[PDB]
């Protein structure tokens, strides 16, 4: 398990959870609506510590780029400016956001080759899959 595995450009081809994950970040109704419909691509880039992931969609695109193990601030898709720190830990990419004393963990993993990205905030879970293209 390296965080080299998770390179690439990834399509989505499944959600769970993830309309009540946003109603829980309090993500306003035409973000919601774009989220729902979207079916972005991940594409995934790392030279040794720094990482890039860009999510890209007709709807929606947002990229971040950070080194890991460094603390950053991250402006997400919905606009929060969160500090965030990615690690490469047990075979598995955390991103951990931490904004207004709250806090959401993002997970990124792959398994039977797919890309498997788990979200969790106050225990609202969701778990979305992408093929690689
Ligand atoms: C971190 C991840 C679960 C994520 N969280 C979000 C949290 C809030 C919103 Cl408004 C969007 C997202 C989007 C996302 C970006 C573009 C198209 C579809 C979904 C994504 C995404 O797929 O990158």
Same mark, same amino acid.
């Given at each position: 398990?390296?965080?080299?595995?998770?390179?690439?450009?990834?399509?989505?081809?499944?959600?769970?959870?993830?309309?009540?994950?946003?109603?829980?970040?309090?993500?306003?109704?035409?973000?919601?609506?774009?989220?729902?419909?979207?079916?972005?691509?991940?594409?995934?880039?790392?030279?040794?510590?720094?990482?890039?992931?860009? $999510?890209?969609?007709?709807?929606?695109?947002?990229?971040?780029?950070?080194?890991?193990?460094?603390?950053?601030?991250?402006?997400?898709?919905?606009?929060?400016?969160?500090?965030?720190?990615?690690?490469? $830990?047990?075979?598995?990419?955390?991103?951990?956001?931490?904004?207004?004393?709250?806090?959401?963990?993002?997970?990124?993993?792959?398994?039977?080759?797919?890309?498997?990205?788990?979200?969790?905030?106050?225990?609202? $879970?969701?778990?979305?899959?992408?093929?690689?293209?």
């Amino acid at each position: 398990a390296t965080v080299q595995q998770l390179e690439g450009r990834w399509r989505l081809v499944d959600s769970k959870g993830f309309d009540e994950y946003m109603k829980e970040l309090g993500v306003g109704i035409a973000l919601r609506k774009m989220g729902a419909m979207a079916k972005p691509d991940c594409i995934i880039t790392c030279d040794g510590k720094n990482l890039t992931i860009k $999510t890209e969609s007709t709807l929606k695109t947002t990229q971040f780029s950070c080194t890991l193990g460094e603390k950053f601030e991250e402006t997400t898709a919905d606009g929060r400016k969160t500090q965030t720190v990615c690690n490469f $830990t047990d075979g598995a990419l955390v991103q951990h956001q931490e904004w207004d004393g709250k806090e959401s963990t993002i997970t990124r993993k792959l398994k039977d080759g797919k890309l498997v990205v788990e979200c969790v905030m106050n225990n609202v $879970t969701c778990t979305r899959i992408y093929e690689k293209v």
